[PDB]
């Protein structure tokens, strides 16, 4: 008798700044990269 966790899969849409009808709210964050490995 053991324990395992389950979760369904979830989806997202991304839409870029459009020259037309679009005005997007800004609720984002910034970061500095640093070195990479």
């Amino acid at each position: 008798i053991k324990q395992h966790s389950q979760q369904t899969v979830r989806e997202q849409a991304t839409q870029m700044a459009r020259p037309g009808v679009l005005l997007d709210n800004d609720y984002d964050k910034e970061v500095t990269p640093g070195r990479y490995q």
Binding site: G20, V21, L23, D24
Partner: protein, 52 residues
């Protein structure tokens, strides 16, 4: 969060339509004003020439 998308799309659409309509109306009214200004000078000089 259920009203975020409708809000954002409507706001931008209204602002863009308003700016475009304002620019077009200003240009048309201003062209009408130039035409009216020429039409009045023309008529005045026509009267003067007829007198002479």
């Amino acid at each position: 969060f259920e009203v975020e998308p409708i809000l954002e799309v409507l706001v931008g659409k209204v602002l863009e339509q308003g700016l475009m309509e304002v620019l077009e109306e200003e240009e048309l009214a201003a062209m009408r004003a130039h035409q009216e200004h020429f039409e009045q000078i023309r008529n005045a000089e026509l009267v003067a020439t007829q007198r002479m």
